[PDB]
């Protein structure tokens, strides 16, 4: 058969690294048309929904342990923030063919035997009876479950215990003093105000609630607009109708309230924020049906249960939440310590998310922009409720570990009180008994309640060839999936053992492989051998160690936790970019680059090293978190002009600021063009701030104050070019050399 072939390469001969590989699709899934009932591209699972670290599964345990390649699944149920974009095919008839034993769903890999009267399950080979209903002007072969790997169903009454819930939101807002002065409150209110129609309300049932919190928990009763403020304070921290209201039936009132709030706590001098008590208050407010508690704050919990200092009550809160289908989202914004490492556990185990805004301050018109944009996109995001996800494996395969935000205790079942759209997940697969067939399969199932009062089941079926050839296992390895696997292993090792252990683990993943390929595969001199499809793995793991999440050296507690929270839940495509940045060479940009083809054309990316940063060029760095506009100190006044308006390069805007519009400068338009293209994503809420940094010249003048402020930028931006030597960490070139030295005799 067409089993992918091993393409040997010398890593030492590919420097700088062929970073264009980061954008290639993983190795093909070698499955002949016969194993598929209706051969099409849509017949096997796409990499956008599921990616196995191995697309040529070892036929037995001893061969997997020998490869030293991990067996895991990068699973992403949804592909966009809004469900109306590129949805999978939807079934409505209600017929759900499922194996009597393993309970797997009908899929493109089942086999119809005996006059197509009965079907043999591809997961457990059991003979099942074909419902006569499977033949009602079309045949059984026109049904999605048989045509597609990725499809969805309208769940019958027996997949729901209670009636689908309305999307419910409870905004737990920090009205303490730190919040007034920073403007977080204003910005938060204003944003809700500007997006009350952006919140999903596909069934007109969406219900909203509002809790303002300082040293007391402030509630508000909201009348139906049709029957035309009531603030209810509660200082007893040891302690429904018209509290959680219809967004449609009380629109004007909700708006009226939101407009008053800012005036109320305007002169608030209280510096208290009883998160714990507020959380429990919100809890009792929606525990009846379940929903999202969205917290916004810029003040470390300091009163009531759950208070923290420079805990575990939260970990118990999440357990309770799993009982009443509640998800918690956190927006932490302040210059002060917020203990993200600890609050992130709230979101983490409820399927929610945490977003941290270091140094937030309304005094910087650009801070507001980032927080507001992300917050708005966040509340506009579609989500499910009462969802549970499980991955079934064909005979011999077993799901052992589960990573990502969600609740999972001692099962192969992950519970999502609400399943967001912007995260990704990962399952470790084990191979117990030896596989007999030439194919093994994995089927992910999602029993959900959409935000349209509907009960659905989304299925993802993946078929992979089996093999006893080590060479073959390697040739079909998904470097980006594998990288992801170890990224998670690293987050665990750290958040549970130690940072150094993490690095040690990351570097070993690369050694074990380079060592394994060497001894188990067979003229030249002294090269570092590896196959082409894994040619970016060493670079990624190495680059990973320089990431703010695993770095050696000093990194503030909040920033570190934040970095770790993001890496563990980010979608593959954004994870790789966060580890290795897209860098663009602007001054010698191609004429198409910067202009449309309303989608703009971007230049080709250049390696992440300062060796390419000519001292007279223009570079833009995108690390998924921010954008860095670096302009060489020796920039010709002409270039300096086309971008900022002046010829004086020492007059340029510094720090976190946007690029001014320079009229009659097609170049200024192309730059601004590219920036905005890098900011438009329909699958993440991320709003990347721009940091403008000035390189150093041969004749650099006197500005002692700036010197400090600027040295920080050149430093920060410099630390992004992960191929370079940085501090006590070696360059990528050296990294490769060090590895050659270790796998030798």
């Amino acid at each position: 058969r067409p089993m992918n072939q091993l393409y040997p390469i010398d890593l030492l001969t590919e420097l700088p690294p062929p970073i264009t590989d980061l954008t290639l699709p993983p190795p093909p899934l070698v499955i002949p048309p016969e194993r598929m009932l209706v051969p099409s591209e849509l017949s096997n699972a796409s990499p956008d929904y599921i990616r196995s670290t191995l697309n040529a599964v070892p036929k037995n345990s001893s061969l997997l342990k020998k490869s030293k390649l991990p067996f895991g699944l990068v699973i992403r149920p949804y592909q966009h923030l809004y469900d109306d974009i590129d949805p999978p095919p939807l079934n409505e008839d209600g017929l759900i063919v499922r194996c009597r034993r393993c309970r797997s769903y009908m899929n493109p890999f089942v086999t119809f035997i005996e006059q197509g009267r009965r079907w043999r399950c591809n997961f457990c080979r059991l003979a099942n009876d074909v419902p006569m209903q499977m033949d009602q002007p079309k045949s059984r072969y026109d049904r999605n479950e048989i045509k597609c790997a990725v499809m969805e169903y309208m769940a019958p009454k027996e997949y729901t215990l209670r009636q689908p819930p309305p999307a419910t939101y409870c905004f737990l807002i920090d009205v303490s003093q730190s919040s007034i002065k920073s403007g977080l409150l204003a910005t938060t209110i204003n944003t809700l105000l500007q997006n009350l129609d952006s919140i999903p309300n596909h069934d007109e049932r969406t219900r909203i609630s509002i809790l303002c919190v300082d040293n007391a928990i402030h509630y508000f009763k909201i009348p139906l607009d049709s029957e035309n403020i009531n603030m209810m304070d509660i200082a007893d921290l040891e302690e429904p109708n018209s509290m959680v209201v219809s967004l449609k039936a009380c629109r004007q009132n909700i708006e009226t309230l939101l407009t008053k709030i800012p005036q109320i706590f305007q002169s608030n001098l209280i510096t208290n924020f009883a998160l714990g008590p507020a959380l429990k208050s919100a809890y009792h407010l929606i525990g009846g049906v379940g929903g999202k508690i969205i917290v916004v704050s810029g003040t470390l919990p300091n009163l009531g249960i759950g208070k923290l200092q420079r805990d575990s009550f939260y970990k118990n809160f999440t357990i309770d939440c799993s009982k009443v289908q509640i998800t918690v989202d956190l927006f932490l914004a302040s210059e002060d310590y917020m203990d993200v490492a600890s609050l992130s556990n709230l979101s983490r185990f409820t399927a929610g998310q945490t977003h941290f805004y270091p140094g937030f301050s309304g005094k910087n018109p650009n801070d507001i922009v980032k927080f507001s944009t992300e917050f708005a996109k966040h509340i506009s995001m579609d989500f499910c409720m009462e969802t549970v996800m499980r991955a079934r494996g064909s005979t011999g395969l077993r799901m052992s570990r589960f990573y990502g935000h969600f609740f999972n205790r001692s099962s192969d079942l992950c519970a999502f009180s609400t399943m967001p759209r912007d995260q990704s997940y990962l399952f470790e697969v084990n191979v117990d008994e030896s596989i007999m067939a030439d194919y093994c399969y994995v089927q992910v199932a999602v029993l959900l309640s959409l935000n349209n009062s509907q009960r659905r089941i989304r299925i993802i079926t993946l078929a992979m060839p089996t093999t006893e050839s080590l060479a073959e296992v390697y040739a079909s390895a998904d470097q980006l999936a594998i990288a992801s696997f170890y990224n998670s292993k690293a987050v665990e090792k750290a958040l549970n053992s130690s940072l150094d252990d993490a690095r040690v683990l990351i570097n070993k993943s690369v050694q074990d492989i380079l060592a394994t390929y060497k001894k188990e595969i067979v003229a030249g001199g002294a090269p570092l051998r590896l196959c082409a499809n894994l040619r970016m793995f060493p670079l990624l793991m190495h680059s990973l160690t320089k990431h703010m999440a695993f770095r050696s050296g000093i990194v503030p507690s909040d920033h570190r936790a934040s970095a770790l929270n993001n890496l563990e839940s980010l979608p593959l495509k954004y994870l790789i970019k966060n580890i290795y940045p897209d860098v663009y060479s602007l001054h010698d940009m191609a004429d198409e680059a910067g202009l449309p083809v309303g989608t703009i054309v971007l230049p080709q990316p250049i390696n992440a090293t300062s060796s390419l940063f000519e001292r007279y060029g223009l570079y833009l760095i995108d690390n998924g978190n921010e954008l860095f506009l670096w302009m060489g100190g020796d920039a010709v006044p002409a270039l300096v002009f086309d971008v900022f308006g002046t010829q004086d390069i020492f007059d340029i805007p510094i720090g976190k600021q946007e690029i001014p519009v320079v009229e009659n400068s097609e170049f200024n338009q192309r730059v601004r063009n590219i920036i905005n293209q890098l900011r438009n994503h329909d699958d993440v809420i991320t709003y990347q701030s721009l940091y403008i940094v000035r390189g150093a010249s041969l004749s650099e003048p006197v500005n002692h104050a700036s010197a400090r402020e600027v040295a920080t930028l050149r430093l920060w931006a410099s630390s992004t070019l992960v191929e370079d030597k940085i501090l006590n960490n070696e360059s990528y070139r050296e990294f490769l050399q060090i590895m050659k030295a270790r796998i030798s005799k």
Binding site: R98, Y159, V388, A415
Partner: peptide
Amino acid sequence: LASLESQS
């Protein structure tokens, strides 16, 4: 809700 997903 695993009870429902497994439909056992």
